[PDB]
Amino acid sequence: KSQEWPGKLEKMKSECELKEEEIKALQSNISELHKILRKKGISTEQFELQNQEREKLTRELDKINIQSDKLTSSIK
Amino acid sequence: IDYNDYKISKQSIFKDLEALSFQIVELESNRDKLIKISNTD
């Protein structure tokens, strides 16, 4: 295994060099995403504010429907 | 004795790789931030 230590270290340093090269690649993805955002707009103002209200009213509707089904079965 | 030196060198280069990976991870947030605007109604 002693003869493989320098070779393993050199391969490891080559992997580090490959990672350093990969570092530069993400700028291309960033530029492509910038181009996409130039192609497509859209904006958001009050989605999160009304999402909680929608969830609350949906839960209320679900509870009301469950109660309605239970009461219908009881009535029958 | 040489095995201990090899282990120390391997640990050092592993720490260097971990630092390189941490540096790589930094740009992921900037990459992902742009996608958020794409799909809303």
Instruction: Quote the CA–CA distance of A22 and A16 in Å, as a whole number.
Output: 10
What φ, ψ does residue A24 adopt, rounded to 5°? -70, -15
> Nearest CA to A29 among B24, B7, B13, B8?
B24
Contact criterion met (CB < 8 Å) for B31 and A43: no
Q: Are B35 and A33 in contact (CB under 8 A)?
A: yes
Q: What is the largest CA-CA distance in chain A?
A: 86
Contact criterion met (CB < 8 Å) for B34 and A16: no
- Chain A residues within an 8 Å CB radius of B19: none
Q: How many C-beta neighbours within 10 Å does residue A13 have?
A: 13
Instruction: Quote the CA–CA distance of A57 and A62 in Å, as a whole number.
Output: 9
What φ, ψ does residue B26 adopt, rounded to 5°? -60, -40
Instruction: Quote the CA–CA distance of B27 and B11 in Å, as a whole number.
Output: 26
